[PDB]
Design a protein around this ligand. Structure first.
Ligand SMILES: Nc1ccn([C@@H]2O[C@H](COP(=O)(O)CP(=O)(O)OP(=O)(O)O)[C@@H](O)[C@H]2O)c(=O)n1
Ligand SMILES: [Mg+2]
Lengths: 248, 69, 49, 231, 315, 97, 230
RNA sequence: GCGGAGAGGUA
């Protein structure tokens, strides 16, 4: 903020969004994931001291679906003291609270485009990319155990075109970094079919063709309608007695 | 677009059965049983029927006489 | 505030004369310009529409 | 029997900042030409800018490299500001390769003939590890105006490589434009004006060419006006 | 419990249904609109009018069957947008704002396709809706049958509802920017550029103001021809020299024939503008009042912007 | 009573329906079959049934209808001002075999 | 690079002096730049001829009264302001009006000179009453650009002139009124394009189309010196 | 995966 109250540092530090030094020292290694500091001899524990390492958190989902990313402030070889701000949390800069951004406003009516409380904005603002936020949706596909048979996560999904599989790996999960759109298959899942009772000629046809009586229905999760973004991360949680998939 | 129907309501002062006669006419026009008596300017059939009403060519009685004929 | 504006070599009254970017003609009665800290709230039209 | 304005001295104070003068302007046309040029310059000046980037070890804009402190997204943000001059081709592929500890600036780009890197000091990254190495290939196009990634997404046209990193294209070199019409005492005339156009750019388009092209565009539209069909 | 009570039944599901062909979005200014129209985002309009699109596409033969029409809408090719523009032409839509207090909470407008995801609402009608552009949202319904279309355009259209049903006075009076601009325009100043020069009409007044040869407010003698319907509906021109401001002349350009010049001659504040609209309605009728209101809006917005009114600490 | 989803690219997907008219259709399965009427699509999409007048699906449905007795008897009213009231028209379809 | 050039120049000429002109295809933002450039040039800088000064044989100051004219002097000046005249060869010419008898002294009653044409012969000038009805005046018309009010010349009137030298506003520009609206227009895929509707009222002499013509001509002539990309 | 609670927010 160009016009603050001084409380910004108190709020930023006291909130857990910043990364703050616990034992002061000198910055040994700086990366956009961790800051490694060599402790000063004063604060250095006599027995079994070692150095301090701070792992940062990069784009994760907040409760409101916003991004929570920390950036390093300090550079290699700078000395840090206990209670300084190493890394900036979301919407904080060098220890200070930066809730939004400060722009040049002019108070005037401009052909009633700011008629009521509405606001007029200059294309330079979108050009300078200053009001663009990153959001982050989480989606979950759950494969449970039904009594007709456990569902499967395989990429072999009945009556889907190979177009839909193209962006899926052999395990059936989207590649990290792939750009998706509404209706695209987010992850592959198969619904089991029972009491198929196929005719004997049909059973012979199934063997040569490779058609699966077990499948014939798809429970695959799809990206919700009208939401489109990049898959930045994927996680897989298996219970006991479940084989680890490639993604795992 | 026809922004005011004031003359059509001045033709029939109830301002409600205006809507009924215009709906009957525009329904005879859409399902192509009939033809417009006014040169259309790329209007849809609702505004065509209102434009016809305001020019005095169509009302309820003209509808009744033409239907029985 | 007046002092701080003076130190920067800006009009002490905090209002400036502005030219209409479309027409190029001056606006009568100079208008207040300056930097204000604004926020984009979580109500995004694409979520609402 | 009239006058008409001739382009006179064009002072260059810095590589980015420039003053252009127009001496023999009739009364009243000062503001007209000033504003017309300001509009055309700010809106329509063709320039080149990076459209998409491919870095080796990174899947998407949001991941992070070992041994760098900026996030990849910030690397794209730094590239958006890269001021470059392309002469012949429409799409060029620049190559940045650096290893070892140090700031990866714009100067380290592989020097091609047709491309001019206007500000070699422009920083891109900071390495922080002896064995950390970054390699990337930045694709630069020519265009006019402002095109964001999200609009071009409709026309993806096989954006299939997940390594591709799309950048919003600000195809405009001009940052700021001001003009002053001031009394141009001509030795045999009472009330004549000179137009002074002061312009701040990212240092790619030269002043003379910018002004010439803008005048060209305005003259072309006026040409459109000269004929009137009435048919 | 299911029957009785708000959440349960009659209130909820039998007087409070949930229609199809409906949308919702944030409202925005859109000054350029006509009183009888509203800016509507392309994508919502396509979504709402989908079945209309299919019907028209099949009539034109662009699609063999309905599924091909659906696929053509889901690709969204230029033909689809052309058909949407053609179908939208005279089709009116209903605009509603969350607390429909009185019957002016629902009004019909002709939509104009625009970019963006926000619905654009005509400024003059905001007072009727109690709408403010600070995140207020509005819902948009589509009348389907022919009788519904005629009813929306006739009974509910913005221009047909200018007088409040409660009392007879106008509802669509200019609110804040318009009235500020007009106020700035009509107020006079003791001394300015072009004091006391005589103008042959408002047109050269505008010549003077836009060229910077006269101040937007400056006392001047102008020859003006007002019209009066004193006879049985005939307009008689009376033409004389009045002492007024440049601004009052500039405003007079819009005013329809029947109205006395006196109307604009004053300071022209909120009340003055409201009674101006009142007299225009009582003398001329609906259509001139509508067009005059639109003109008032445009001139007020324009000249408010030209005024450059701001608020400094020293003000 | 066979649902015909038009996928769009000259391919129809036929699936039976809850209201189909026969116990089992010889060729049909509940999972459905894709067909194309264009010989070139069939040559490009071997997963589809190439439907012609001689295709078993059509010959099958034909035998199914022409052997059954549905569609053999119905009544209908006609509203025509240009005819007398209560007049009788009788459509008779003989079959030479 | 490749720009978008306007097509479909439609012109709705209601009341020959009043012309609406529409230009739907254009590029973003050029609506206001082009509309305004045209408007200002048309309004402020347009070569024309108009009455500048007048000498009345009977009255020495603009507030005195002549016997038998009900109209005041200011009304006569205002009527003289409306005279739209076109002279061919001469730069500055002096017309004389001398009328008697009852009725409206109109522009037609001026003495018919060679090079000068009065485009509106029916423009009223004065009204003369009965039995005296003596009106005589000499009006001087000059060529110039734009609009020049009395106040700016009378400011620089240290060169003292004899009484009766009555200055009149010079209406050179043939355009009486000019305005332009810009509104949204889309070419089937690109929506950020705009239409220019130019409403123009001229003073009889030239029809609006040709006014626009010479405006764009003049502006192009000034620009010619820089434009070379062709 | 139609529902209903609880919490918060918008006008
Ligand atoms: N608990 C609530 C609080 C608000 N509302 C709605 O918010 C608006 C209040 O306007 P308002 O008159 O109170 C403020 P505004 O109209 O913007 O004018 P001003 O700011 O210059 O004073 C009304 O439409 C209410 O229906 C509601 O339904 N329930
Ligand atoms: Mg509000």
């Amino acid at each position: 903020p160009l016009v603050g109250t001084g409380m910004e540092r108190a709020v930023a530090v006291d909130s857990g969004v910043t990364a703050v030094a616990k034992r002061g020292g000198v910055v040994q290694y700086v990366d956009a994931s961790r800051i490694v500091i060599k402790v000063n001899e004063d604060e250095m524990y006599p027995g079994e001291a070692g150095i301090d390492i701070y792992n940062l958190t990069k784009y994760t989902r907040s409760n409101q679906n916003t991004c929570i990313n920390q950036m390093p402030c300090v550079s290699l070889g700078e000395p840090v003291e206990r209670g300084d701000v190493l890394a900036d949390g979301p919407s904080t800069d060098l220890g200070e609270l930066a809730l939004g951004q400060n722009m040049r406003v002019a108070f005037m009516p401009w052909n009633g485009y700011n008629f009521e409380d509405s606001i007029l904005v200059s294309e330079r603002v979108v050009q300078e990319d200053r009001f663009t936020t990153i959001h982050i949706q989480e989606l979950a596909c759950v494969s449970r155990d039904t009594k007709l048979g456990p569902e499967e996560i395989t990429a072999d999904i009945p009556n889907v075109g190979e177009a839909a599989l193209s962006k899926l790996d052999e395990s059936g999960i989207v590649y990290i970094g792939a750009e998706v759109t509404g209706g695209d298959i987010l992850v592959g899942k198969v619904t089991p079919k029972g009491e198929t009772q196929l005719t004997p000629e049909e059973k012979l046809l199934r063997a040569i063709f490779g058609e699966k009586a077990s499948d014939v229905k798809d429970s695959s999760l799809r990206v919700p309608n009208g939401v489109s973004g990049t898959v930045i991360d994927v996680q897989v949680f298996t219970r006991d007695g479940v084989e680890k998939d490639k993604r795992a | 677009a026809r922004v005011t129907v004031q003359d059509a309501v001045e033709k029939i002062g109830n301002r409600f059965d205006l809507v009924l006669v215009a709906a009957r006419r525009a329904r005879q026009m859409q399902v192509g049983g009939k033809d417009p008596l006014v040169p259309e300017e790329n209007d849809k059939t609702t505004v065509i029927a209102l434009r016809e009403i305001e020019e005095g060519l169509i009302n309820n009685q003209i509808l009744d006489v033409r239907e029985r004929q | 505030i007046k002092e701080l504006l003076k130190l920067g070599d800006l009009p002490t009254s905090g209002q400036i004369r502005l030219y209409d970017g479309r027409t190029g003609e001056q606006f009568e009665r100079p208008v207040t310009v300056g930097y204000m800290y604004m926020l984009k709230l979580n109500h995004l039209v694409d979520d609402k529409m | 029997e009239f006058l008409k304005p001739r382009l006179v001295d064009i002072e260059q104070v810095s590589s980015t900042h420039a003053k252009v003068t127009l001496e023999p302007l009739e009364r009243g046309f000062g503001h007209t030409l000033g504003n017309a040029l300001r509009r055309i310059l700010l809106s329509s000046m063709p320039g080149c800018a990076v459209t998409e980037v491919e870095i080796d070890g990174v899947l998407h804009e949001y991941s992070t490299k070992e041994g760098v402190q900026e996030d990849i997204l910030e690397i794209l943000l730094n590239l958006k500001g890269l001021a470059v001059r392309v002469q012949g081709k429409d799409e060029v592929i620049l190559t940045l390769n650096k290893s070892g500890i140090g700031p990866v600036t714009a100067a380290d780009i592989t020097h091609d003939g047709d491309v001019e890197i206007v500000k070699p000091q422009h920083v891109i990254c900071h390495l922080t590890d002896e064995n950390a190495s970054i390699s990337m290939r930045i694709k630069v196009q020519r265009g006019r105006g402002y095109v964001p990634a999200s609009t071009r997404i409709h026309s993806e046209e096989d954006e299939r490589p997940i390594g591709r990193l799309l950048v919003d294209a600000c195809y405009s070199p001009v940052e700021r434009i001001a003009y002053n019409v001031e009394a141009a005492r001509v030795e045999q005339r009472t009330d004549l004006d000179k137009l002074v156009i002061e312009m701040e750019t990212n240092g790619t388009i030269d002043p003379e060419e910018a002004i010439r092209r803008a005048a060209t565009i305005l003259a072309e539209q006026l040409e459109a006006f000269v004929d009137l069909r009435d048919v | 419990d299911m029957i009785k009570g708000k959440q349960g039944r009659f209130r909820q599901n039998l007087l409070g249904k949930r229609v199809d062909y409906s949308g919702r979005s944030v409202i925005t200014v859109g000054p350029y609109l006509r009183l009888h129209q509203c800016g509507l985002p392309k994508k919502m309009a396509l979504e709402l009018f989908k079945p209309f699109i299919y019907g028209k596409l099949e009539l034109r033969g662009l699609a063999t069957t309905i599924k091909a029409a659906k696929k053509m809408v889901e690709r969204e090719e230029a033909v689809v947008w052309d058909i949407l523009d053609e179908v939208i032409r005279e089709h009116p839509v209903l605009l509603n704002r969350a607390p429909t207090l009185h019957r002016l909470g629902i009004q019909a407008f002709e939509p104009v396709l625009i970019e963006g995801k926000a619905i654009q609402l005509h400024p003059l009608v905001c007072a009727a809706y109690n709408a403010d552009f600070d995140g207020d949202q509005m819902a948009v319904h589509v009348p389907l049958t022919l009788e519904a279309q005629l009813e929306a355009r006739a009974l509910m259209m913005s221009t047909n509802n200018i007088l409040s049903p409660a009392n007879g006075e106008p509802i669509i009076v200019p609110s804040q920017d318009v009235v500020l601009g007009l106020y700035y325009m009509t107020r006079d100043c003791v001394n300015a550029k072009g004091e006391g020069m005589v103008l042959t009409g408002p047109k050269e007044a505008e010549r003077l103001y836009r060229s910077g040869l006269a101040s937007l407010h400056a006392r001047v003698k102008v020859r003006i021809t007002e019209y009066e319907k004193d006879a049985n509906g005939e307009l008689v021109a009376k033409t004389s020299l009045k002492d007024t401001t440049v601004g009052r002349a500039i405003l007079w350009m819009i005013v329809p024939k029947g109205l006395p010049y006196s109307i604009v001659n004053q300071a022209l504040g909120k009340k003055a503008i409201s009674k101006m609209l009142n007299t225009c309605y009582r003398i001329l009728g609906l259509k001139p009042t509508v067009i005059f209101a639109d003109q008032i809006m445009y001139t007020g917005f324009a000249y408010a912007a030209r005024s450059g009114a701001s608020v400094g600490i020293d003000d | 009573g066979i649902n015909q989803d038009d996928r769009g690219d000259n391919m129809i997907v036929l699936t039976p329906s809850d209201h189909m008219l026969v116990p089992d259709f010889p060729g049909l399965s509940e999972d459905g079959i894709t067909i194309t009427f264009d010989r070139e699509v069939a040559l490009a999409r071997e997963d589809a049934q190439f439907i012609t007048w001689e295709h078993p699906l059509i010959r099958n449905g034909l035998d199914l209808i022409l052997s059954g007795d549905t569609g053999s008897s119905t009544i209908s009213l006609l509203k025509n001002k240009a005819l007398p009231v209560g007049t009788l028209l009788v459509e008779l379809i003989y079959v030479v075999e």
